[PDB]
């Protein structure tokens, strides 16, 4: 029909390995390391 | 006529012999109105089933608080040159993008607050990102009428999401499927397809702005409320509404989810409601916030925040619904007495630092006290019965 | 008993004075990305 | 797209258009009209007879103008949270 | 006598000995007649509506998920 | 001291009746209304006193399971005077409701301006 | 042809600012004048799907049909509006005035149980009360003063009660009534003027001992910081 | 009409419902607790001479104000 509505972009990405998935963020432990990261931005 | 007489007893026995502490304090004490004419077949049963009703209404508002310590300013991050409007955490806790009126999605990092890189591509303000938990995505919406996908593995817009009649107030993203839905000034919340682009249904069932989203998993998946005062249930299968929650009086801008609770909690001008999820079944009232809201976020540890338009900012104990702190934005040093103003904030991925966006070009970080001890720092007094709820 | 020239004269406090000593201010005009 | 258009019709409702360099400004001005018009009605209590937007829609086209040609648009009888809520906006609107 | 129903059904004597029931006409239509709120009861908060024992306020586990998912 | 008694009730009427909100204004109507009420024919004594002898089984002015108020159908009199009291009642609204300026609409417009303005 | 060039004129206006009810109300008020029914229902409940939330439009509604004598019409309309907006009480009002100066009170009866259903403010039960009184019947009018304390304890209300029963006419029953305020108010809630109301009711019925001995009781229940009227009021009736 | 008449009818242009042959949108009252049964078929009789007569005063008013010209023609 329209020039912007031809197909594009038909692979939907999805976020790989290291990349931060649901799997690694429920296994990671975001409270002392937010508190480690605060600090050492604190130390500078 | 002195048919009796010696009421010294009458006038002590009939006050003096009951519980001595007062129940409801409205209680007709039971035993003592029977002795009178009239209807008791129909008119008794009635009254004694209002007087359980109202016991049990008094009884079951006297839910003593807990403590959650209070909250302070911890960090001012002033980059922005327009009012910051949205404001969405990236999965990982790393950093946190928010749009503002100056046509920018500025990226910051949540520990330092240093300014990443700055994402331009909007004719007018940015008012909702939301960076999605399963894709390398992060999707944004403006007033502008147009709807785009920002690929964060190269930082430029790939898709465009087109059908939309006036600006665009809010966006959300299904948690499971692959599907995000848009909410805007049309009175129509669309149900757009992430990979295709596609507007697969069309919930159209307000009369004005639907100026608040909510979607989840389970049925009903996207919750919308409008400037009709009304929130509705819809769907996601057959686009149609289930229920309408018509409790409100004036538009409903804030709309939450609780992470853990299965209920959901709304805020507008007048009263902030939470409501039971399936099949939307009222739970009590958070009063004391007389304020146009526009933001309400639940922590994980039933922390409950809520932003108003002219900075004030009351965190509510989920559990009991009893605000136990008060506390009023302070402008930056450019601004006015009337620049004050809060549009949008969230709590991290863990829950102990909360985001503020203010109507005043700047992003505040909250933070819990540290040092603790209730004894030291006591939350906003509790008067336990007073008098029961109008409703 | 100093005068105040225009370009010298400061209208608000700074953000300093209006925050506080417990909270870091940053001002991120510039981009580090 | 021709044989289509000739064979069915126009089908021009329900389409948008995209806002094109030329109606930015008189969008940006209806969208901010629309949310004073939903800051009156919010901010206005229950039963105070809410048709009063247009008044002050006036009102803020003209503390705008003022604003433009450096006048101090003091209304006496203006009550203080429309005054404040104008304020605001047109801070908003000169910023931009 | 050829009348049929020319106008709704009266009100019902309810199962829980409510007298009589008025909330047809707000279920009228809506499709969703069983989720409509049309009584005082509707704006009492479910920690004291009487009638109610233990509220269960967890999601639907993960069978409904993956069920709702799926359709 | 009757006579007393009623002046005292026609003054104590008289400071409460000296626009608030729709609420009270809805209950002020009604209670004018009733003012202007004339009950008690001959119709409801005699129903009260007729059908009650043969009270076989339910009350007459029983209502918990009561199944003939649906169909109560009046009769011509009181139709008539729903429509008297109503037509009364809207000519005495349209009764009741009704050189600074180039134009009737800026007269209008310079009495709206003097009404807020004239103070300051 | 005149209909028709009225109707398109006003049809183009009201799709112009569909929002503008004044112009649905002239369009059904100038249609009812010659065809009474049919579409002028329609053309009104079109314009309740574009607002039903405006109580002119309702009332406008309901004066339109009762103009031309349809009454169970204008019954179910007003059905409709009541349980649409229970929370205003003008519709409510309107109807149980009309359903009572009908003469149908027994239906009427039923409205006022629907309409307190919802926990009104006072001056809809006293509406009822004045209802109750305009026909006697004051043995199921006590049950609904009953009705009226329980929904909304205050002093005020126990004092009406009391005035009802003393005008029913009886003695125990006004002292019974006032200790069982008594005993539901309790020691937080009683206030002088109440005490002072129950003893002019036992000078009014000429029992003495009764009245010196509540003036004692009341003296020593409340602090002497909050004792004027009642010690004045004692006074008066001991030198009375 | 006066003389004689070929009679006339009034003009309708091409692309309007003209609002004369059914109701324009065609929306009925909710039905209610309360049936009407009667309180419109006992009475069809009365929504066609209501209707008749009101016609009919229509005509009879434009008659006598017609004639009017010529009765308060000097007044």
Redesign the interface.
């Given at each position: 029909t329209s020039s912007r509505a031809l197909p594009a972009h038909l692979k939907l990405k999805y976020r790989q390995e290291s990349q931060g998935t649901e799997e690694e963020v429920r296994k990671q432990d975001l409270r002392e390391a937010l508190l480690r990261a605060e600090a050492a931005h604190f130390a500078t | 006529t002195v048919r009796a007489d010696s009421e010294n007893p009458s006038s002590q026995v009939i006050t003096k012999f009951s519980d001595p502490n007062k129940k409801i304090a409205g209680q007709v004490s039971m035993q003592s109105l029977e002795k009178i004419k009239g209807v008791p077949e129909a008119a008794h049963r009635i009254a004694g089933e209002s007087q359980a009703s109202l016991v049990k209404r008094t009884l079951a508002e006297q839910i003593r608080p807990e403590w959650h310590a209070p909250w302070t300013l911890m960090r001012v991050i002033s980059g922005h040159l327009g009012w910051v409007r949205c404001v969405d955490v990236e999965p990982g806790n790393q950093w946190f993008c928010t749009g503002a009126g100056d046509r920018t999605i500025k990226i910051w990092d949540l520990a330092s607050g240093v300014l990443k890189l700055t994402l331009t591509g909007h004719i007018a303000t940015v008012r909702g990102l939301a960076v999605s938990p399963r894709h390398p995505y992060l999707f944004s919406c403006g007033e502008d009428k147009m709807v785009k996908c920002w690929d964060l593995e190269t930082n430029k817009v790939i898709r465009h999401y087109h059908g939309h009649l006036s600006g665009v107030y809010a966006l959300k993203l299904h948690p499971t499927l692959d599907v995000l839905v848009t909410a805007g000034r049309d009175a129509v919340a669309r149900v757009w397809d992430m990979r295709t682009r596609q507007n697969v249904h069309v919930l159209s069932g307000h009369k004005s702005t639907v100026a608040s989203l909510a979607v989840q998993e389970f049925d009903p998946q996207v919750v919308t409320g409008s400037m009709d005062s009304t929130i509705r249930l819809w769907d996601l299968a057959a686009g149609k509404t289930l229920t309408t929650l018509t409790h409100h009086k004036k538009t409903v801008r804030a709309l939450s989810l609780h992470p853990d609770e299965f209920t959901f909690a709304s805020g507008s001008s007048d009263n902030i409601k939470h409501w039971k999820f399936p099949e939307g079944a009222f739970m009590g009232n958070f009063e004391g916030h007389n304020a146009i809201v526009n933001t309400l976020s639940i922590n994980s540890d039933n922390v409950m925040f809520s932003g108003a338009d002219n900075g004030s900012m009351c965190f509510w104990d989920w559990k009991s619904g009893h605000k136990y702190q008060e506390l009023q934005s302070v402008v930056q040093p450019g601004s006015l007495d009337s620049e004050a103003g809060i549009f949008a904030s969230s709590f991290d991925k863990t829950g102990l630092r909360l985001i503020t966006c203010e109507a005043d070009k700047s992003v505040k970080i909250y933070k819990q006290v540290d040092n603790a001890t209730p004894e030291t720092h006591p939350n906003l007094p509790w008067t336990p019965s007073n008098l029961r709820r109008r409703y | 008993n100093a005068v105040v020239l225009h370009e010298d004269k400061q209208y608000y406090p700074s953000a300093e004075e209006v925050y506080g000593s417990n909270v870091d201010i940053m001002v991120q005009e510039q981009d580090t990305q | 797209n021709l044989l289509a258009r000739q064979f069915e019709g126009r089908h021009s409702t329900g389409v948008a258009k995209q806002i094109t360099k030329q109606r930015v400004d008189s969008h940006q001005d209806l969208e901010l009209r629309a949310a004073v018009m939903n800051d009156i009605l919010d901010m206005i209590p229950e039963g105070i007879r809410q048709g009063k937007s247009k008044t002050i829609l006036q009102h803020l086209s003209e503390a705008w103008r003022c604003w433009k040609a450096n006048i101090p648009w003091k209304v006496p009888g203006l009550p203080a949270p429309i005054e404040n809520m104008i304020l605001r906006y047109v801070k908003s609107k000169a910023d931009w | 006598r050829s009348?049929k129903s020319?106008?709704?059904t009266?009100?019902l004597?309810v199962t829980s000995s409510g007298?009589?029931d008025?909330?047809?006409?707000?279920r009228?239509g809506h499709?969703?007649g069983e989720?409509?709120?049309?009584?005082?009861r509707?704006?009492?908060?479910?920690?004291?509506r009487?009638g109610v024992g233990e509220?269960s306020?967890?999601?639907?586990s993960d069978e409904?998920?993956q069920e709702?998912?799926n359709? | 001291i009757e006579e007393s008694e009623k002046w005292d009730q026609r003054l104590r009427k008289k400071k409460q009746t000296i626009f608030s909100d729709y609420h009270s204004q809805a209950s002020k109507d009604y209670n004018r209304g009733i003012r202007d009420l004339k009950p008690d024919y001959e119709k409801y004594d005699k129903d009260k006193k007729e059908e009650k002898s043969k009270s076989r089984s339910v009350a007459l002015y029983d209502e918990a399971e009561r199944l003939d108020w649906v169909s109560n159908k009046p009769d011509k009199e009181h139709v008539e005077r729903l429509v008297e009291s109503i037509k009364k009642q809207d000519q005495r609204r349209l009764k009741n409701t009704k050189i600074t300026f180039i134009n009737e609409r800026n007269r209008k417009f310079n009495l709206k301006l003097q009404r807020f303005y004239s103070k300051y | 042809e005149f209909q028709g060039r009225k109707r398109k004129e006003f049809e183009d206006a009201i799709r112009r600012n569909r929002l503008a009810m004044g112009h649905w109300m002239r369009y059904g008020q100038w249609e009812l004048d010659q065809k009474e029914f049919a579409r002028a229902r329609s053309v009104f409940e079109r314009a309740l799907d574009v607002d039903s939330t405006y109580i002119p439009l309702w009332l406008k509604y309901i004066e339109c049909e009762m103009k031309n004598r349809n009454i169970n019409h204008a019954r179910n309309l007003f059905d409709r509006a009541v349980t649409q907006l229970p929370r205003v009480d003008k519709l409510w009002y309107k109807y149980v005035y009309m359903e009572e100066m009908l003469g149908n009170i027994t239906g009427c009866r039923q409205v006022f149980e629907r309409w307190l259903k919802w926990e009104p403010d006072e001056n809809c039960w006293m509406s009822y009360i004045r209802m109750e009184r305009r026909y006697h019947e004051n043995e199921r009018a006590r049950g609904i003063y009953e009705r009226f304390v329980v929904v909304h304890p205050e002093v005020t209300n126990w004092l009406r009660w009391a005035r009802f029963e003393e005008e029913c006419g009886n003695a125990a029953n006004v002292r019974q009534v006032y200790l069982a305020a008594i005993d539901a108010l309790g020691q937080e809630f009683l206030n002088e003027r109440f005490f002072i109301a129950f003893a002019k009711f036992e000078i009014r019925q000429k029992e003495y001992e009764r009245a010196r001995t509540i003036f004692k009781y009341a003296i020593d229940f409340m602090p002497r910081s909050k004792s004027m009227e009642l010690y004045k009021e004692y006074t008066h009736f001991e030198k009375q | 009409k006066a003389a004689g008449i070929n009679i006339k009818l009034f003009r309708r242009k091409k692309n309007e419902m003209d609002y004369n042959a059914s109701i324009p949108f065609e929306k009925k009252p909710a039905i209610g607790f309360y049936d009407t049964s009667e309180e419109d078929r006992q009475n069809f009789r009365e929504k066609r001479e209501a209707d008749q007569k009101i016609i009919e005063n229509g005509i009879r008013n434009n008659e006598m104000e017609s004639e009017g010209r010529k009765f308060g023609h000097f007044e």
């Amino acid at each position: 029909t329209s020039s912007r509505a031809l197909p594009a972009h038909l692979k939907l990405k999805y976020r790989q390995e290291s990349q931060g998935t649901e799997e690694e963020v429920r296994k990671q432990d975001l409270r002392e390391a937010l508190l480690r990261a605060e600090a050492a931005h604190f130390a500078t | 006529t002195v048919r009796a007489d010696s009421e010294n007893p009458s006038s002590q026995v009939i006050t003096k012999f009951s519980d001595p502490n007062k129940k409801i304090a409205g209680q007709v004490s039971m035993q003592s109105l029977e002795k009178i004419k009239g209807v008791p077949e129909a008119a008794h049963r009635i009254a004694g089933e209002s007087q359980a009703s109202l016991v049990k209404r008094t009884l079951a508002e006297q839910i003593r608080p807990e403590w959650h310590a209070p909250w302070t300013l911890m960090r001012v991050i002033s980059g922005h040159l327009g009012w910051v409007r949205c404001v969405d955490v990236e999965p990982g806790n790393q950093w946190f993008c928010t749009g503002a009126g100056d046509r920018t999605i500025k990226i910051w990092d949540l520990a330092s607050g240093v300014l990443k890189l700055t994402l331009t591509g909007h004719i007018a303000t940015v008012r909702g990102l939301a960076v999605s938990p399963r894709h390398p995505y992060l999707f944004s919406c403006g007033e502008d009428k147009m709807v785009k996908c920002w690929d964060l593995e190269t930082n430029k817009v790939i898709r465009h999401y087109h059908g939309h009649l006036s600006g665009v107030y809010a966006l959300k993203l299904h948690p499971t499927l692959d599907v995000l839905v848009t909410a805007g000034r049309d009175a129509v919340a669309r149900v757009w397809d992430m990979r295709t682009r596609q507007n697969v249904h069309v919930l159209s069932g307000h009369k004005s702005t639907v100026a608040s989203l909510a979607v989840q998993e389970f049925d009903p998946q996207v919750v919308t409320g409008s400037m009709d005062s009304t929130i509705r249930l819809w769907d996601l299968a057959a686009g149609k509404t289930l229920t309408t929650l018509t409790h409100h009086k004036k538009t409903v801008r804030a709309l939450s989810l609780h992470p853990d609770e299965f209920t959901f909690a709304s805020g507008s001008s007048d009263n902030i409601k939470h409501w039971k999820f399936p099949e939307g079944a009222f739970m009590g009232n958070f009063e004391g916030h007389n304020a146009i809201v526009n933001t309400l976020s639940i922590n994980s540890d039933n922390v409950m925040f809520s932003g108003a338009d002219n900075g004030s900012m009351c965190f509510w104990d989920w559990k009991s619904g009893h605000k136990y702190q008060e506390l009023q934005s302070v402008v930056q040093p450019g601004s006015l007495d009337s620049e004050a103003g809060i549009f949008a904030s969230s709590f991290d991925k863990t829950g102990l630092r909360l985001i503020t966006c203010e109507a005043d070009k700047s992003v505040k970080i909250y933070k819990q006290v540290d040092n603790a001890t209730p004894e030291t720092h006591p939350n906003l007094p509790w008067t336990p019965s007073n008098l029961r709820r109008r409703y | 008993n100093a005068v105040v020239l225009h370009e010298d004269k400061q209208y608000y406090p700074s953000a300093e004075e209006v925050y506080g000593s417990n909270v870091d201010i940053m001002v991120q005009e510039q981009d580090t990305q | 797209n021709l044989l289509a258009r000739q064979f069915e019709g126009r089908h021009s409702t329900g389409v948008a258009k995209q806002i094109t360099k030329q109606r930015v400004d008189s969008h940006q001005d209806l969208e901010l009209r629309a949310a004073v018009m939903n800051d009156i009605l919010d901010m206005i209590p229950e039963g105070i007879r809410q048709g009063k937007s247009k008044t002050i829609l006036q009102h803020l086209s003209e503390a705008w103008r003022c604003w433009k040609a450096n006048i101090p648009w003091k209304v006496p009888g203006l009550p203080a949270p429309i005054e404040n809520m104008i304020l605001r906006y047109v801070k908003s609107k000169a910023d931009w | 006598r050829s009348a049929k129903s020319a106008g709704n059904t009266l009100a019902l004597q309810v199962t829980s000995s409510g007298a009589v029931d008025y909330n047809a006409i707000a279920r009228q239509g809506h499709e969703h007649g069983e989720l409509v709120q049309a009584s005082f009861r509707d704006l009492i908060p479910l920690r004291a509506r009487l009638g109610v024992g233990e509220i269960s306020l967890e999601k639907p586990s993960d069978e409904q998920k993956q069920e709702v998912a799926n359709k | 001291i009757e006579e007393s008694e009623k002046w005292d009730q026609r003054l104590r009427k008289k400071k409460q009746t000296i626009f608030s909100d729709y609420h009270s204004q809805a209950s002020k109507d009604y209670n004018r209304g009733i003012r202007d009420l004339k009950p008690d024919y001959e119709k409801y004594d005699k129903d009260k006193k007729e059908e009650k002898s043969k009270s076989r089984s339910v009350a007459l002015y029983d209502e918990a399971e009561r199944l003939d108020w649906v169909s109560n159908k009046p009769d011509k009199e009181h139709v008539e005077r729903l429509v008297e009291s109503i037509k009364k009642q809207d000519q005495r609204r349209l009764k009741n409701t009704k050189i600074t300026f180039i134009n009737e609409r800026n007269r209008k417009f310079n009495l709206k301006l003097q009404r807020f303005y004239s103070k300051y | 042809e005149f209909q028709g060039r009225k109707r398109k004129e006003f049809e183009d206006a009201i799709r112009r600012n569909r929002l503008a009810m004044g112009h649905w109300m002239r369009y059904g008020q100038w249609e009812l004048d010659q065809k009474e029914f049919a579409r002028a229902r329609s053309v009104f409940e079109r314009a309740l799907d574009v607002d039903s939330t405006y109580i002119p439009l309702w009332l406008k509604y309901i004066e339109c049909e009762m103009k031309n004598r349809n009454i169970n019409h204008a019954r179910n309309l007003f059905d409709r509006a009541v349980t649409q907006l229970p929370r205003v009480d003008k519709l409510w009002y309107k109807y149980v005035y009309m359903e009572e100066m009908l003469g149908n009170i027994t239906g009427c009866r039923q409205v006022f149980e629907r309409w307190l259903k919802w926990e009104p403010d006072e001056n809809c039960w006293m509406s009822y009360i004045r209802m109750e009184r305009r026909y006697h019947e004051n043995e199921r009018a006590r049950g609904i003063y009953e009705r009226f304390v329980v929904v909304h304890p205050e002093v005020t209300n126990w004092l009406r009660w009391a005035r009802f029963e003393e005008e029913c006419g009886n003695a125990a029953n006004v002292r019974q009534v006032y200790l069982a305020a008594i005993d539901a108010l309790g020691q937080e809630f009683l206030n002088e003027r109440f005490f002072i109301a129950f003893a002019k009711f036992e000078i009014r019925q000429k029992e003495y001992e009764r009245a010196r001995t509540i003036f004692k009781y009341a003296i020593d229940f409340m602090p002497r910081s909050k004792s004027m009227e009642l010690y004045k009021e004692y006074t008066h009736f001991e030198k009375q | 009409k006066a003389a004689g008449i070929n009679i006339k009818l009034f003009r309708r242009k091409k692309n309007e419902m003209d609002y004369n042959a059914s109701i324009p949108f065609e929306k009925k009252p909710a039905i209610g607790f309360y049936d009407t049964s009667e309180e419109d078929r006992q009475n069809f009789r009365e929504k066609r001479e209501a209707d008749q007569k009101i016609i009919e005063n229509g005509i009879r008013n434009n008659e006598m104000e017609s004639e009017g010209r010529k009765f308060g023609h000097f007044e």
